[PDB]
Amino acid sequence: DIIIATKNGKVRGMQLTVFGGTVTAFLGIPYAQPPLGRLRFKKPQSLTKWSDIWNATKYANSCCQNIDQSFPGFHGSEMWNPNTDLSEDCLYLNVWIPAPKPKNATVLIWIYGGGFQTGTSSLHVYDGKFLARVERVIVVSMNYRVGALGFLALPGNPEAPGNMGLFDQQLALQWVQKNIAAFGGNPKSVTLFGESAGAASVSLHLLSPGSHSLFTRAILQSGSFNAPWAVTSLYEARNRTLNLAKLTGCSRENETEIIKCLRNKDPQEILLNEAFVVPYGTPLSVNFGPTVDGDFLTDMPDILLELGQFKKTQILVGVNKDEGTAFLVYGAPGFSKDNNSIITRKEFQEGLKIFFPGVSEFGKESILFHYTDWVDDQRPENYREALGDVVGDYNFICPALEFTKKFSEWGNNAFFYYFEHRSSKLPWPEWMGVMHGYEIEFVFGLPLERRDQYTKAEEILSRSIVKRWANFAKYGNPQETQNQSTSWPVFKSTEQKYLTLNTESTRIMTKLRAQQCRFWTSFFPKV
Ligand SMILES: *[C@@H]1O[C@H](CO[C@@]2(C)OC[C@@H](O)[C@H](O)[C@@H]2O)[C@@H](O[C@@H]2O[C@H](CO)[C@@H](O)[C@H](O)[C@H]2NC(C)=O)[C@H](O)[C@H]1NC(C)=O
Ligand SMILES: CCCCN[C@@H](Cc1c[nH]c2ccccc12)C(=O)NCC[C@H]1CCCN(Cc2ccccc2)CC1
Ligand SMILES: *[C@@H]1O[C@H](CO)[C@@H](O[C@@H]2O[C@H](CO)[C@@H](O)[C@H](O)[C@H]2NC(C)=O)[C@H](O)[C@H]1NC(C)=O
Ligand SMILES: *[C@@H]1O[C@H](CO[C@@H]2O[C@@H](C)[C@@H](O)[C@@H](O)[C@@H]2O)[C@@H](O)[C@H](O)[C@H]1NC(C)=O
Ligand SMILES: *[C@@H]1O[C@H](CO[C@@H]2O[C@@H](C)[C@@H](O)[C@@H](O)[C@@H]2O)[C@@H](O)[C@H](O)[C@H]1NC(C)=O
Ligand SMILES: *[C@@H]1O[C@H](CO)[C@@H](O)[C@H](O)[C@H]1NC(C)=O
Ligand SMILES: *[C@@H]1O[C@H](CO)[C@@H](O)[C@H](O)[C@H]1NC(C)=O
Ligand SMILES: [Cl-]
């Protein structure tokens, strides 16, 4: 009933009833020629004009990916698996615009995480219709190729240059540039936001010169490119794809002939060998991920960060209180989502070997040293809580803090939050705490659905969070001005102030996990 004319053709949307109002969803618009046939592994190719009206009325195909199978029938895990047909034909995106059509609204662009191996924009917790409704921003999300099909790399070779998933992202950003005006959006006020691997994607779009002109601002949720899992080395990248070449019988001398050999293999056989390529995998392993390809990424990101080579603008950055616990039940011994996983000193030690496999015996002892100095002896949760902190502090909280320090050191406004509210609809047990990934729903305004059994404190917090994100998007400043909400101070290198987000106190604190992270960011990286 509502048709928006785009630069490639007409598209018919769909009308949703949201909170006594209306949002217009355009679900499943393609933003690239499908990366099939000879196009597999190659950069996303431009999409040529269509003559008809494309029907963007259902989510499109999710890109190929392995599914999480460790808890069949358990919502806490299955809520993250694709809710849409897998297919190599998956370069599509979604647009939620407020009804009535705005004049030119801030656009929020969501980039999902999932280790760069999994994920889809279709997910229930990435629904932008609440944001379009409640704050009159336009929400855009895109599907981008993951795992090997998105990030397999023989650096140099254009048949598989690496970073194709990032280029998918970027070409969707280009689409919002050429097209969001027709939807009533302002291409000049575009805020990227994403979570974990999506957050690290957003941070890399700050470094990549071809994205500098495609967005204004950046929100980084539980992830940043300087995290240990974010970049696979050029050594690792090559050893990873050769392992894949052996395991599919495509081992050749000629590099390009390897590639087209892996191009007549089917998505299923490629998907199934991807898991075995990681020499010693961990719950945190990125089988096939971002590389310094020389195209999207011209140098090693930690040097671009260290010497100020990034887009100058405001960042909103933050992490959750128990980032690390989700991964503990994917391999660590003595752990379980179904009991309270009290572990002993020897199970903890065995857990370090599982999360730090190729790390020195003395390196692992150093982790044990800094994290086993209890305030007190007999508290049996000590080892269980410690291994969660170790994995959280090392993988998320401290790369994020370090990213924000170094990024603020170049004069730009930065805001750090510490999300510490555990969802009352949280399917995982309570020892797991304020888990990785479970701020997302608050950011998207789901607790504003009074029908969805969230408590009223939750609805309030999500409303405040949603106002802070929209104000950051619109005005570069994540305050809630109207109600008497705590002012959110900018994060500066000396004082390192951050805002805590929760049901009760919105309090201002300083120097989060400071002692833990002098360890990780300045002693451990040497072992
Ligand atoms: C918490 O649970 C783990 C694992 O197990 C449970 C809940 O899930 C898997 C089932 O097959 C088990 O029967 C059990 O219901 C316990 O860890 C196990 O401990 C055993 C000693 O009793 C060892 O022989 C096993 O190797 C070990 N298995 C794993 C996967 O860790 C753990 O002891 C439980 N802890 C508490 C405090 O209940
Ligand atoms: C040889 C072994 C390969 C392991 N390959 C990883 C890929 C990966 C997924 N995620 C990750 C988050 C950080 C780092 C890496 C990854 C893997 O499969 N690890 C299993 C544990 C995660 C499964 C996904 C579901 N959980 C919730 C969640 C949260 C945020 C975004 C999406 C999903 C997270 C635990
Ligand atoms: C939408 O908002 C933007 C402001 O963000 C307006 O963009 C202006 O575009 C003209 C075009 O020549 C420029 O000269 C102005 O400098 C822009 N404004 C700013 C503040 O930079 C735009 O006019 C608005 N209205 C629309 C698109 O209808
Ligand atoms: C695209 O969609 C067109 C519209 O179908 C109808 O649209 C509105 C008015 C609702 O009543 C909806 O339930 C209907 O399905 C179709 O007529 C057209 O054939 C479609 N074209 C393609 C290529 O899918
Ligand atoms: C890929 O690498 C596997 C492990 O190699 C060992 O560990 C790495 C981290 C380096 O220290 C390296 O020098 C070691 O040899 C090998 O087992 C495997 O054969 C390699 N695969 C290919 C195709 O080369
Ligand atoms: C590999 O085969 C391709 C065939 O397209 C050829 O162009 C290339 O020269 C070969 N590799 C080398 C190193 O010559
Ligand atoms: C501010 O207070 C009003 C009082 O009714 C409340 O409804 C609203 O959700 C609060 N938050 C805002 C406007 O961000
Ligand atoms: Cl929806």
XYZ file of C-alpha atoms and ligand atoms in Angstrom:
705
model
C 0.000 0.000 0.000
C 2.977 2.340 0.561
C 5.534 2.200 -2.247
C 8.870 3.996 -1.944
C 10.814 4.483 -5.158
C 14.486 3.561 -4.720
C 17.476 4.100 -6.968
C 17.094 0.503 -8.243
C 13.312 0.177 -8.380
C 10.082 0.435 -6.472
C 9.587 -1.417 -3.187
C 6.312 -2.121 -1.384
C 6.385 -2.052 2.387
C 4.137 -3.255 5.154
C 2.295 -1.540 7.980
C 2.603 -2.539 11.610
C 0.439 -1.543 14.552
C 2.762 -0.523 17.414
C 1.578 0.957 20.728
C -1.611 2.505 19.378
C 0.453 3.854 16.473
C 1.899 2.736 13.136
C 5.385 1.805 11.936
C 6.144 1.007 8.294
C 8.478 -1.985 7.879
C 10.430 -2.685 4.681
C 11.683 -6.212 5.428
C 14.102 -7.845 3.020
C 15.356 -5.305 0.485
C 18.388 -6.633 -1.449
C 21.493 -4.480 -1.442
C 23.785 -6.527 -3.721
C 23.869 -9.010 -6.589
C 23.600 -12.400 -4.799
C 27.073 -13.737 -4.060
C 26.522 -17.102 -5.767
C 28.395 -19.062 -8.402
C 31.643 -17.377 -9.387
C 30.702 -14.518 -6.984
C 31.093 -16.657 -3.852
C 34.023 -15.362 -1.742
C 34.180 -12.174 -3.797
C 33.342 -8.644 -2.715
C 29.625 -7.783 -2.871
C 28.738 -6.761 -6.412
C 26.466 -3.887 -7.383
C 22.779 -4.545 -7.984
C 21.286 -3.641 -11.348
C 17.874 -1.956 -11.716
C 14.639 -3.914 -11.514
C 11.472 -2.930 -13.324
C 8.737 -4.208 -10.991
C 7.803 -3.438 -7.375
C 9.874 -5.545 -4.990
C 7.837 -6.845 -2.056
C 9.751 -6.179 1.171
C 7.154 -7.762 3.404
C 9.032 -10.650 5.075
C 12.543 -11.095 6.417
C 14.847 -12.463 3.733
C 17.207 -15.453 3.882
C 19.811 -15.560 6.632
C 23.356 -16.191 5.337
C 24.784 -19.703 5.683
C 26.149 -20.525 9.134
C 26.524 -23.350 11.642
C 23.750 -23.470 14.272
C 24.241 -23.523 18.045
C 23.296 -27.076 19.094
C 24.476 -27.316 22.671
C 20.950 -26.817 24.157
C 18.242 -28.170 21.845
C 14.854 -26.748 22.734
C 16.280 -24.172 25.169
C 15.177 -20.621 24.376
C 18.280 -19.078 25.980
C 20.394 -20.457 23.138
C 17.896 -21.017 20.347
C 16.792 -17.358 20.425
C 20.180 -16.660 18.772
C 19.884 -19.160 15.896
C 18.543 -18.076 12.482
C 14.764 -17.646 12.344
C 14.897 -17.691 8.566
C 15.952 -19.993 5.723
C 19.700 -20.202 5.374
C 20.999 -19.490 1.916
C 24.053 -18.078 0.215
C 21.572 -15.567 -1.259
C 21.239 -13.384 1.825
C 22.563 -9.862 1.098
C 19.376 -8.062 2.156
C 18.371 -5.422 4.695
C 15.419 -4.031 6.671
C 14.135 -0.485 7.160
C 11.695 0.606 9.868
C 10.392 4.129 9.319
C 7.890 5.959 11.542
C 4.366 6.574 10.359
C 3.588 9.164 9.285
C 6.748 9.416 7.162
C 9.250 11.813 8.786
C 10.867 14.778 7.084
C 14.413 13.643 7.717
C 15.061 11.443 10.764
C 18.229 10.180 12.406
C 18.976 6.706 11.073
C 20.196 3.940 13.360
C 22.025 1.110 11.618
C 22.268 -2.196 13.476
C 25.092 -4.685 12.885
C 24.486 -8.022 14.674
C 27.241 -9.995 16.372
C 27.843 -13.715 16.543
C 31.593 -14.227 16.458
C 31.575 -13.316 12.705
C 30.397 -16.912 12.228
C 26.666 -16.612 12.980
C 23.815 -14.127 13.224
C 20.927 -12.598 11.325
C 19.052 -9.322 11.287
C 15.732 -11.238 11.413
C 16.114 -11.960 15.141
C 13.294 -11.056 17.532
C 15.612 -8.980 19.737
C 16.741 -6.871 16.729
C 13.203 -5.670 15.899
C 13.476 -1.971 15.160
C 9.746 -1.275 15.060
C 9.740 -0.121 18.693
C 12.547 2.376 18.024
C 10.858 3.714 14.890
C 7.653 4.154 16.887
C 8.830 5.535 20.222
C 11.613 7.886 19.030
C 10.836 8.466 15.325
C 14.269 7.303 14.201
C 14.589 5.112 11.146
C 16.155 1.755 12.028
C 18.154 -0.142 9.436
C 19.665 -3.612 9.832
C 21.474 -5.765 7.288
C 22.422 -9.376 6.688
C 26.091 -9.858 5.991
C 28.023 -13.015 5.115
C 29.558 -14.817 8.087
C 32.111 -17.541 8.765
C 34.187 -18.807 5.881
C 31.841 -17.565 3.163
C 32.212 -14.041 4.572
C 35.825 -13.948 5.790
C 37.884 -16.727 4.189
C 41.140 -15.063 3.130
C 44.077 -15.641 0.854
C 45.270 -12.051 1.347
C 46.038 -10.433 -1.984
C 44.009 -12.852 -4.099
C 40.759 -11.133 -5.267
C 39.004 -14.501 -5.543
C 39.120 -14.584 -1.725
C 40.579 -11.298 -0.406
C 39.049 -11.507 3.082
C 36.611 -9.193 4.881
C 33.786 -9.812 2.381
C 31.284 -9.653 5.254
C 32.588 -6.230 6.278
C 32.289 -5.174 2.645
C 28.678 -6.443 2.740
C 28.064 -4.178 5.731
C 29.772 -1.278 3.985
C 27.760 -1.649 0.801
C 24.580 -1.638 2.852
C 25.829 1.590 4.450
C 26.325 2.903 0.909
C 22.687 1.955 0.197
C 21.405 4.032 3.142
C 23.501 6.887 1.735
C 21.974 6.690 -1.755
C 18.439 5.809 -0.635
C 17.310 6.642 2.894
C 16.236 10.147 1.869
C 13.352 8.544 -0.047
C 12.191 6.972 3.236
C 12.283 10.334 4.967
C 15.662 9.689 6.557
C 18.594 12.044 6.829
C 21.706 10.397 5.283
C 23.801 12.938 7.190
C 22.742 11.742 10.692
C 23.471 7.988 10.636
C 24.500 6.239 13.870
C 26.005 2.773 13.578
C 25.363 0.427 16.477
C 26.071 -3.286 17.023
C 26.798 -5.841 19.726
C 29.901 -7.976 20.391
C 31.183 -8.979 16.926
C 28.789 -6.393 15.509
C 30.258 -3.845 17.920
C 33.747 -4.769 16.702
C 32.470 -4.363 13.133
C 31.279 -0.852 14.004
C 34.683 -0.042 15.492
C 36.400 -1.223 12.302
C 34.138 0.980 10.193
C 35.740 3.821 12.184
C 39.156 2.771 10.872
C 38.248 1.866 7.330
C 38.613 4.856 4.981
C 35.873 3.686 2.597
C 33.341 3.911 5.449
C 34.356 7.303 6.842
C 31.751 9.134 4.749
C 28.946 6.576 5.295
C 27.998 7.332 8.917
C 28.157 9.988 11.641
C 28.480 8.320 15.045
C 29.070 4.956 16.639
C 27.671 2.878 19.490
C 29.734 -0.148 20.579
C 27.870 -2.744 22.670
C 30.051 -5.368 24.385
C 32.716 -5.414 21.641
C 35.612 -3.607 19.951
C 38.241 -4.403 17.342
C 41.118 -4.564 19.870
C 39.527 -7.541 21.645
C 41.687 -10.690 21.364
C 39.093 -12.544 19.243
C 38.430 -9.728 16.783
C 41.261 -9.989 14.197
C 42.598 -13.198 12.767
C 46.282 -12.830 11.824
C 47.473 -13.178 8.248
C 49.319 -16.301 9.416
C 46.196 -17.749 11.038
C 44.027 -16.704 8.107
C 46.184 -18.628 5.647
C 46.626 -21.720 7.856
C 42.849 -21.664 8.403
C 41.899 -21.719 4.724
C 44.529 -24.324 3.754
C 43.116 -26.565 6.502
C 39.729 -26.019 4.874
C 41.272 -26.821 1.464
C 42.698 -30.102 2.730
C 39.472 -31.121 4.462
C 37.514 -30.658 1.202
C 40.131 -32.201 -1.107
C 40.735 -28.818 -2.732
C 44.403 -28.747 -1.730
C 46.217 -27.450 -4.807
C 49.468 -25.720 -5.664
C 47.793 -22.920 -7.616
C 46.086 -20.584 -5.171
C 43.271 -19.443 -7.454
C 42.602 -23.063 -8.475
C 42.053 -23.868 -4.797
C 39.440 -21.135 -4.770
C 37.316 -22.290 -7.655
C 37.617 -25.809 -6.264
C 35.989 -24.580 -3.055
C 33.445 -22.849 -5.271
C 31.887 -26.051 -6.625
C 31.640 -27.380 -3.093
C 28.224 -26.830 -1.589
C 27.351 -24.562 1.338
C 26.806 -27.602 3.562
C 30.217 -29.185 3.045
C 31.933 -25.797 3.463
C 29.898 -25.111 6.595
C 30.814 -28.472 8.135
C 34.574 -28.300 7.684
C 34.795 -24.717 9.084
C 34.711 -25.990 12.695
C 37.777 -28.186 12.377
C 40.050 -25.461 10.953
C 40.727 -23.767 14.316
C 43.892 -25.497 15.637
C 42.759 -25.275 19.253
C 39.297 -23.779 19.366
C 37.618 -22.087 22.300
C 34.043 -20.909 22.889
C 35.513 -17.538 21.781
C 37.209 -18.734 18.585
C 36.654 -16.873 15.318
C 37.036 -19.559 12.668
C 37.106 -17.045 9.795
C 37.146 -13.370 10.646
C 38.420 -9.874 10.001
C 41.915 -9.676 8.518
C 44.226 -6.848 7.547
C 43.376 -7.216 3.859
C 44.908 -3.935 2.678
C 41.518 -2.910 1.215
C 38.974 -2.553 4.013
C 41.790 -2.486 6.555
C 45.063 -0.890 5.482
C 47.196 -1.626 8.586
C 46.957 -3.485 11.882
C 44.040 -1.895 13.757
C 45.932 -1.584 17.064
C 48.388 0.742 15.310
C 45.650 2.754 13.599
C 44.067 3.110 17.060
C 47.374 3.901 18.806
C 48.312 6.653 16.293
C 44.904 8.298 15.806
C 44.072 6.897 12.348
C 40.282 6.749 12.614
C 37.096 8.690 11.979
C 36.779 11.589 14.450
C 33.315 11.649 16.032
C 31.518 10.650 19.215
C 31.402 7.087 20.507
C 29.063 5.455 22.989
C 30.742 2.334 24.395
C 29.807 -0.108 27.109
C 29.837 -3.612 28.529
C 27.720 -5.868 30.743
C 28.625 -6.975 34.259
C 28.914 -10.716 33.490
C 30.232 -10.708 29.906
C 32.120 -13.939 30.428
C 29.665 -16.407 31.978
C 27.788 -17.324 28.765
C 30.940 -18.957 27.417
C 31.678 -20.976 30.565
C 28.981 -23.559 29.850
C 30.257 -24.150 26.303
C 33.307 -26.189 27.324
C 34.600 -25.370 30.795
C 34.555 -28.374 33.165
C 32.228 -28.523 36.161
C 29.970 -25.857 34.636
C 26.305 -26.264 33.790
C 23.296 -24.098 33.012
C 21.295 -26.636 35.088
C 23.197 -26.638 38.425
C 25.012 -23.778 40.169
C 28.451 -24.870 38.811
C 30.472 -24.554 41.992
C 33.950 -25.581 40.905
C 37.151 -26.349 42.754
C 40.659 -24.949 42.419
C 41.570 -27.805 40.071
C 38.510 -27.300 37.830
C 39.321 -23.591 37.549
C 42.892 -24.489 36.517
C 41.454 -26.887 33.949
C 39.192 -24.071 32.741
C 42.132 -21.761 32.043
C 43.629 -24.460 29.814
C 40.308 -24.493 27.931
C 40.107 -20.731 27.398
C 43.876 -20.112 26.957
C 44.939 -23.253 25.089
C 48.131 -22.092 23.413
C 49.114 -19.868 26.338
C 52.217 -20.539 28.441
C 52.098 -22.597 31.612
C 53.451 -19.483 33.339
C 50.905 -17.298 31.571
C 48.089 -19.466 32.924
C 49.659 -19.389 36.375
C 49.705 -15.589 36.115
C 45.956 -15.546 35.459
C 45.468 -17.817 38.459
C 47.627 -15.527 40.590
C 45.834 -12.254 39.911
C 42.350 -13.787 40.075
C 42.726 -16.316 42.950
C 43.577 -13.837 45.716
C 40.219 -14.050 47.450
C 39.067 -11.559 50.007
C 38.160 -14.898 51.656
C 38.768 -18.639 51.642
C 35.682 -20.776 51.960
C 33.147 -18.986 49.717
C 32.858 -21.972 47.257
C 31.574 -19.739 44.405
C 35.063 -18.167 44.343
C 36.432 -20.333 41.542
C 33.164 -20.220 39.570
C 32.930 -16.428 39.705
C 36.653 -16.069 38.990
C 36.646 -17.925 35.688
C 33.688 -15.834 34.491
C 35.507 -12.616 35.415
C 38.710 -13.864 33.746
C 36.934 -14.589 30.464
C 34.820 -11.437 30.661
C 37.606 -9.059 31.691
C 40.008 -10.446 29.119
C 37.644 -10.730 26.161
C 35.302 -7.752 26.438
C 35.422 -5.306 29.330
C 39.096 -4.384 29.030
C 39.457 -4.153 25.260
C 36.358 -1.901 25.415
C 37.819 0.310 28.145
C 41.138 0.414 26.330
C 39.440 1.288 23.054
C 37.591 4.151 24.770
C 40.684 5.559 26.522
C 42.772 5.608 23.352
C 39.867 6.884 21.277
C 39.087 9.704 23.720
C 42.806 10.635 23.819
C 42.331 12.235 20.379
C 39.900 14.869 21.566
C 36.575 13.148 20.889
C 33.617 12.773 23.206
C 33.123 9.243 24.542
C 30.537 7.781 26.885
C 31.013 4.524 28.757
C 28.198 2.561 30.424
C 28.221 -0.496 32.677
C 24.996 -2.459 32.136
C 24.230 -4.415 35.310
C 20.531 -5.318 35.176
C 19.743 -9.024 34.808
C 16.571 -9.519 32.737
C 13.748 -11.010 34.771
C 12.797 -13.029 31.666
C 16.383 -14.392 31.404
C 16.299 -18.124 30.463
C 19.748 -18.888 31.934
C 20.304 -19.537 35.670
C 21.161 -16.789 38.099
C 24.806 -17.653 38.757
C 25.368 -16.536 35.152
C 24.397 -12.991 36.143
C 24.079 -10.030 33.743
C 24.983 -11.963 30.650
C 26.661 -11.236 27.348
C 24.037 -10.227 24.804
C 21.152 -9.423 27.164
C 21.292 -5.676 27.099
C 20.291 -5.890 23.419
C 16.573 -6.285 24.146
C 16.612 -3.280 26.464
C 18.302 -1.187 23.777
C 15.590 -2.218 21.291
C 12.756 -1.369 23.668
C 11.195 -4.786 24.140
C 10.494 -4.155 27.875
C 8.190 -1.442 26.573
C 5.823 -4.217 25.471
C 3.678 -4.373 28.601
C 2.292 -7.701 27.326
C 5.712 -9.415 27.307
C 5.896 -10.030 31.102
C 8.774 -7.624 31.847
C 8.528 -5.901 35.207
C 7.694 -2.220 35.361
C 11.190 -1.315 36.504
C 12.416 -2.950 33.289
C 10.007 -0.957 31.126
C 11.276 2.236 32.770
C 14.964 1.369 32.300
C 14.494 0.393 28.656
C 12.619 3.673 28.077
C 15.465 5.631 29.601
C 18.093 3.630 27.665
C 16.135 4.088 24.447
C 16.007 7.847 25.034
C 19.763 7.926 25.723
C 20.603 5.989 22.534
C 18.303 8.128 20.386
C 19.694 11.328 21.849
C 23.201 10.084 21.189
C 22.099 9.188 17.669
C 20.328 12.517 17.108
C 22.479 14.895 19.163
C 25.774 13.185 19.955
C 24.854 13.324 23.664
C 23.184 10.332 25.455
C 21.297 12.238 28.155
C 17.718 11.753 29.234
C 16.949 15.432 29.791
C 13.251 15.631 30.641
C 12.961 13.364 33.642
C 15.501 13.946 36.380
C 17.949 11.386 34.982
C 21.571 11.246 36.069
C 23.815 13.211 33.765
C 26.123 10.985 31.739
C 29.647 12.456 31.957
C 32.070 12.119 29.070
C 34.803 9.488 29.491
C 38.245 11.117 29.698
C 41.609 9.410 30.059
C 42.457 10.807 33.495
C 39.253 10.333 35.425
C 37.607 7.564 33.382
C 34.000 8.202 34.405
C 31.239 5.788 33.410
C 27.482 5.507 33.917
C 25.926 2.357 35.402
C 22.571 1.256 33.934
C 20.129 -0.634 36.144
C 16.664 -0.595 37.738
C 17.477 1.468 40.840
C 20.567 3.638 40.702
C 21.855 5.340 37.645
C 25.153 6.169 39.369
C 28.434 7.694 38.075
C 31.589 5.738 38.904
C 35.240 5.750 37.847
C 37.994 3.436 36.596
C 35.985 0.260 36.044
C 37.844 -3.049 36.660
C 41.028 -0.980 36.939
C 43.209 -3.504 38.780
C 42.010 -6.430 36.641
C 42.863 -4.614 33.494
C 46.261 -3.256 34.204
C 46.892 -7.014 34.302
C 45.237 -7.942 31.007
C 46.092 -4.921 28.917
C 49.630 -4.386 30.153
C 51.175 -7.519 31.732
C 49.470 -10.538 30.133
C 49.854 -9.476 26.426
C 53.565 -10.259 26.756
C 53.366 -13.889 27.967
C 27.105 -29.671 37.499
O 26.929 -30.481 36.317
C 28.136 -30.999 35.735
C 27.741 -31.741 34.477
O 26.438 -32.303 34.562
C 25.103 -32.627 34.667
C 24.129 -31.589 35.225
O 24.961 -32.554 33.208
C 25.484 -33.618 32.434
C 24.987 -34.976 32.935
O 25.423 -36.050 32.104
C 25.413 -35.161 34.402
O 24.943 -36.407 34.927
C 24.809 -34.038 35.266
O 23.404 -34.227 35.401
C 28.872 -31.876 36.744
O 30.113 -32.293 36.177
C 30.359 -33.721 36.128
O 30.869 -34.225 37.363
C 31.083 -35.644 37.339
C 31.404 -36.067 38.755
O 30.219 -36.301 39.503
C 32.202 -35.960 36.357
O 32.408 -37.369 36.310
C 31.847 -35.437 34.972
O 32.997 -35.526 34.137
C 31.389 -33.972 35.001
N 30.827 -33.601 33.713
C 30.904 -32.367 33.204
C 30.272 -32.173 31.858
O 31.459 -31.447 33.805
C 29.133 -31.074 38.012
O 29.701 -31.907 39.012
C 27.840 -30.475 38.571
N 28.128 -29.659 39.740
C 27.269 -29.466 40.749
C 27.760 -28.608 41.875
O 26.150 -29.952 40.751
C 36.517 -24.319 17.154
C 35.438 -23.575 17.988
C 34.808 -22.353 17.271
C 33.979 -21.442 18.177
N 33.095 -20.500 17.388
C 32.462 -19.489 18.324
C 31.999 -18.230 17.536
C 31.367 -17.178 18.425
C 29.985 -17.014 18.634
N 29.770 -15.967 19.509
C 31.018 -15.416 19.910
C 31.300 -14.342 20.793
C 32.662 -13.999 20.992
C 33.720 -14.710 20.342
C 33.390 -15.789 19.477
C 32.021 -16.155 19.240
C 31.238 -20.192 19.016
O 30.400 -20.787 18.337
N 31.117 -20.122 20.445
C 30.016 -20.735 21.158
C 29.535 -19.737 22.298
C 28.595 -18.544 21.852
C 27.457 -19.069 20.957
C 26.425 -18.020 20.521
C 25.291 -17.818 21.512
N 25.617 -16.908 22.738
C 24.687 -15.607 22.804
C 25.007 -14.470 21.796
C 25.454 -13.222 22.268
C 25.749 -12.169 21.384
C 25.592 -12.318 19.992
C 25.133 -13.559 19.507
C 24.851 -14.612 20.396
C 27.135 -16.599 22.800
C 28.000 -17.840 23.095
C 17.388 17.551 6.364
O 18.294 17.890 7.364
C 19.560 18.308 6.817
C 20.388 18.813 7.979
O 21.057 17.775 8.684
C 19.443 19.363 5.691
O 20.631 19.213 4.923
C 20.999 20.457 4.333
O 21.244 20.232 2.949
C 21.578 21.420 2.219
C 21.668 21.022 0.761
O 22.362 21.992 -0.013
C 22.879 22.001 2.765
O 23.163 23.218 2.085
C 22.768 22.253 4.265
O 24.047 22.599 4.782
C 22.267 21.008 5.003
N 22.027 21.314 6.407
C 22.946 21.153 7.370
C 22.517 21.525 8.759
O 24.071 20.726 7.134
C 18.229 19.210 4.772
O 17.951 20.409 4.057
C 17.024 18.789 5.593
N 15.791 18.730 4.806
C 15.490 17.970 3.736
C 16.512 16.975 3.272
O 14.409 18.080 3.171
C 3.611 -8.033 -4.348
O 2.478 -7.755 -3.458
C 1.259 -7.408 -4.133
C 0.255 -7.000 -3.073
O -0.470 -8.095 -2.528
C -1.443 -7.602 -1.567
O -1.030 -6.342 -1.011
C -1.818 -5.758 0.098
C -2.872 -4.834 -0.510
C -2.396 -6.801 1.081
O -3.796 -7.007 0.843
C -1.590 -8.122 0.970
O -2.092 -9.062 1.941
C -1.680 -8.705 -0.461
O -0.841 -9.861 -0.606
C 0.817 -8.588 -4.990
O -0.416 -8.296 -5.640
C 1.905 -8.883 -6.015
O 1.533 -9.997 -6.817
C 3.243 -9.169 -5.325
N 4.292 -9.357 -6.316
C 5.348 -10.158 -6.136
C 6.331 -10.214 -7.268
O 5.504 -10.809 -5.105
C 48.169 -25.320 10.738
O 48.803 -25.215 12.026
C 48.761 -26.405 12.831
C 49.449 -26.059 14.131
O 50.780 -25.632 13.879
C 51.511 -25.340 15.087
O 50.910 -24.288 15.830
C 50.982 -22.969 15.234
C 50.242 -22.020 16.163
C 52.433 -22.552 14.977
O 53.155 -22.465 16.205
C 53.086 -23.582 14.053
O 54.448 -23.198 13.896
C 52.967 -25.008 14.645
O 53.446 -25.974 13.714
C 49.454 -27.554 12.106
O 49.315 -28.741 12.881
C 48.853 -27.759 10.722
O 49.636 -28.715 10.013
C 48.829 -26.450 9.926
N 48.145 -26.645 8.658
C 48.691 -26.326 7.481
C 47.847 -26.598 6.271
O 49.817 -25.843 7.395
C 46.814 -20.260 -11.579
O 45.836 -20.479 -12.611
C 45.352 -19.273 -13.214
C 44.248 -19.676 -14.167
O 43.239 -18.679 -14.258
C 46.510 -18.557 -13.904
O 46.040 -17.337 -14.468
C 47.638 -18.284 -12.914
O 48.766 -17.768 -13.614
C 48.048 -19.561 -12.173
N 49.015 -19.262 -11.126
C 50.288 -18.914 -11.353
C 51.123 -18.649 -10.136
O 50.742 -18.810 -12.488
C 9.364 10.386 31.976
O 8.208 10.467 32.882
C 6.941 10.101 32.302
C 5.886 10.307 33.369
O 4.652 9.685 33.026
C 7.003 8.666 31.782
O 5.747 8.272 31.236
C 8.101 8.570 30.733
O 8.177 7.246 30.215
C 9.440 8.984 31.356
N 10.566 8.812 30.440
C 10.818 9.444 29.277
C 9.801 10.443 28.788
O 11.843 9.199 28.627
Cl 8.704 -6.573 13.107
